[PDB]
């Protein structure tokens, strides 16, 4: 995508040499924002082939409030293996905070039903936010939330959403984070009978690992391809009743996939 | 300021007509980001005179973890009167979340000392965040946090900071929110022996009230003036030991102040 290749370029020209946790060097910038009008097509990077089936399964797993790897394993989605313990537990990460934020007085707040309530009954609200940055539970999580906070917005029958991402690997992680959230805006919108608007991505420490330079130069050689179209084949009775098979991506013709190795 | 007058202009040309809580119309945009290099001068709007003494007193009140209006009243700072109850309580708003975030298991987390710890002992961290969006305490607060979340960043001896603001009145509220946070970056930096970097402002629903149009047209007539210089006269033994008198703004020559009325 134009906006993503423009960000790759900006990290190469402007990033400072910053290191990662006792490891790999990165070229890093702080504070970046991009906008994707979801009416123009689904924001899946076409300059390298991306596989959406793990993205869909991870999103539907978050909406169930699930913190264990079992569901993902039943579908042979293995993206969280690296963080899970011996029982498949990841601690109170995303799904638990989205669906059951624990209060000091023993309540569990379902921020996803709150947000639907607000989009339907109070759409002009400037408080339509779900947060996964629960400070009192960060020590028990396998990793602190990268996509920590997001806000919905409704104007002229269109639902927009801004994601704050505290940390971002532009090569490996970001194409996956944009598709996952753009998919959530389409599901939210379908349920509130609203059209899709913008997905605004805001990042904090936005970086490229040093051992992904050959791959970032190769991808910047490629011309972007027309963006695909997401079709949802069914309208579920609620946001918690979607299935893997309900989604189809139409017209996706990417360039070949590029591998990116990681240090250990 | 150039970046602020450019945002005022963008809300007038691009904002949609959106209403406020059972009230006033607004022209509104969603998702905006501005950058202020704090080495170029202190980001206090010069196209209208702004009074910094309430800003300083409110910031030092937040750092004490104070949720009652008494301190502000002792200094005849009256900006929070509208929200306080009969005893001067505002509920668990900002200061309480910054200094004593309550956990489910009875702890109180001091996010401001955590952040100093990280800037000194682990400055390359991508997790140096303080959050005031405590979902389980939002019902007891006088108002939900507008400046909800912020992240620090260190690269090349320079401390930067990004603020996420869910809601923003561009005329009345934003010049005050930029100065308050730019002042916190200078205090943090002094305490960690780092230089100042950038203040990146990110907003969510960024708006102009309809009954501030004459005033926004008047301010856009004015040419910006050279930015002032903040001098801190003393280095306190910690971030909690600053006093009103430690700060001076040097070289501030604004245009006259403009009044902005509010509906009730
Ligand atoms: C932890 C490293 O992986 C990155 N990362 C992790 C999770 C995610 O959703 N997106 C992302 O980009 C952040 C940092 O570069
Ligand atoms: C509640 C109204 O006042 C605005 N507001 C409030 C507090 C603050 O720090 N900044 C700000 O701009 C948000 C919205 O426009």
Swiss-Prot record, chains A, B:
DUMP binds at residues 21, 126-127, 166-169, 177, 207-209. Keywords: Cytoplasm, Formylation, Methyltransferase, Nucleotide biosynthesis, Repressor, RNA-binding, Transferase, Translation regulation. Its main location: cytoplasm. GO terms for biological process: dTMP biosynthetic process; dTTP biosynthetic process; methylation; regulation of translation; response to radiation. Pathway: Pyrimidine metabolism; dTTP biosynthesis. It is found in: Cytoplasm. Although not discussed in the published references, Met-1 is represented in the submitted PDB entries as being modified by either a formyl, or a carboxyl group. The N-terminal is probably N-(dihydroxymethyl)methionine, the hydrated form of N-formylmethionine. Belongs to the thymidylate synthase family. Bacterial-type ThyA subfamily. Catalyzes the reductive methylation of 2'-deoxyuridine-5'-monophosphate (dUMP) to 2'-deoxythymidine-5'-monophosphate (dTMP) while utilizing 5,10-methylenetetrahydrofolate (mTHF) as the methyl donor and reductant in the reaction, yielding dihydrofolate (DHF) as a by-product. This enzymatic reaction provides an intracellular de novo source of dTMP, an essential precursor for DNA biosynthesis. This protein also binds to its mRNA thus repressing its own translation. GO terms for molecular function: magnesium ion binding; protein homodimerization activity; RNA binding; thymidylate synthase activity. The keyword ATP-binding does not apply. It catalyses: dUMP + (6R)-5,10-methylene-5,6,7,8-tetrahydrofolate = 7,8-dihydrofolate + dTMP. This is Thymidylate synthase. (6R)-5,10-methylene-5,6,7,8-tetrahydrofolate binds at residues 51, 169, 263. The keyword rRNA-binding does not apply. The active site is at residue 146. Its EC number is 2.1.1.45. One of its GO terms (cellular component) is cytosol. Homodimer. It comes from the Bacteria.
